[PDB]
Subunit: 140 residues, 4 copies
Amino acid sequence: MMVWTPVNNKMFETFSYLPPLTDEQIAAQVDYIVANGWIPCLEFAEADKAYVSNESAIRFGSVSCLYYDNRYWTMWKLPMFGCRDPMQVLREIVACTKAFPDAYVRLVAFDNQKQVQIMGFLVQRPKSARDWQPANKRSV
Amino acid sequence: MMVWTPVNNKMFETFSYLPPLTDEQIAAQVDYIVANGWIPCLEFAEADKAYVSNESAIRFGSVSCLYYDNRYWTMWKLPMFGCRDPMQVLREIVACTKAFPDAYVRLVAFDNQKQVQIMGFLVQRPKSARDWQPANKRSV
Amino acid sequence: MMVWTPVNNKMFETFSYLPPLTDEQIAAQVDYIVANGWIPCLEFAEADKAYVSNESAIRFGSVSCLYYDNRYWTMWKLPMFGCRDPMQVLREIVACTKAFPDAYVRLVAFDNQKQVQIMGFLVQRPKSARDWQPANKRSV
Amino acid sequence: MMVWTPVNNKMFETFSYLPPLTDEQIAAQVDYIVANGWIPCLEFAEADKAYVSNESAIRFGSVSCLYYDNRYWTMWKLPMFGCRDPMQVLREIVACTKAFPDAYVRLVAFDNQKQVQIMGFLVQRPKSARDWQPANKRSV
């Protein structure tokens, strides 16, 4: 019987329960975006703005239902409309992480027919982050 | 006239006003669980999640009555259903404290007829805790 | 034209706008308590509990009017009922400050006919307090 | 395509999107105040009181609309009524920044016919401020 640790074991939505994505695995996800005609986009946030919080609810009456701060991140340039080249997306990941080496960075893609984000996963976390576990240390 | 100190004098419910439990005293409490047929279970929490607090009430209307965060701790494995062996409980205390050496750890027992926790006391506090007094420094 | 400083210029109610009380000045205030038949008492608080705050209002509906945390301090022993000797009060100030050398300590007096505190002033602040000005540095 | 940075890029209302004002540029703004017959005034605030916040809203019902802490700063002396000399304003800037070298200081001017502040801009920020970007580092 192994025990799932509650300590410093924060997650990051899709794919965060798998082993960290290799460069080949990321490339494959990017091919999937392009093959489906979705719109790639990068978003980023400093460590203090990375996880959902409640601080703005201090200003509210009884209307906090499904309100959370830090759902929005900051857009890196613009969504890559008309992009049909996976290398272009990989180059923007490099450019974004270079400009913001200490930020959380996530890759997302949009479907404009449904008007919804259709994919998303973390591609960088700050090296100073101490609030997460490697796969083999998630249970003890 | 001695003065009960308000400074760094936090307590931990049942038995926290007595001298710290010896290993023999813990064993005796464990025998009491087994003799009564109750279900032993261990729970633990990191220092930041150990004491009752109010942070979630920021999301509330006028409904904070008997709401507190940090009442729930994290379960170590499962409650030990059918356990009639005190040595088994002692071995789980050892295993739990070893896996989480910096956590607060409490031993509890359940009665399934009343469906309520029927006993509970702290069995470990982190070595770095500075918010509590030894028995002879509780008053000055 | 001198400018009253807003920075690190916290005050402590009665007499805090005067030069700090000498031992002779404190003795005189104590004589005043005794001459009037009032009940002397000492109260103390650690630095974090010294000034009025709002943290408990997170639990409230619209009822925060004239609610503040940290108005209560901690009683030193009991109010000195029947005390008609100023030296006894001075000895308790010494004893209280010795047991809590890093606390704020105030002397108060009660009138039991009106049932209200009738006098009060600070008799010790922690040496580590940096949030207050000397009389000659209160304006610049 | 350059990306506007969200990190440590706080601004300070009027003129904060231009290059920092030179002494000659400040003098020109001051001439503008005097030429129009407006009332010059200086205000200042320590770093913790410089930007708009919400802390007092913890005491509120549903009435936080257009309530913010830290809109008021501290007045330096009095508004300079009748002042028709730009050198006088410049001398008060010097005197204010000297007395409060670690404070944010802003120059404002009042129109008493409209009864409203008619101009305002930052004239000093603390040297220890790390929450702002130079013009050439505002986008990456």
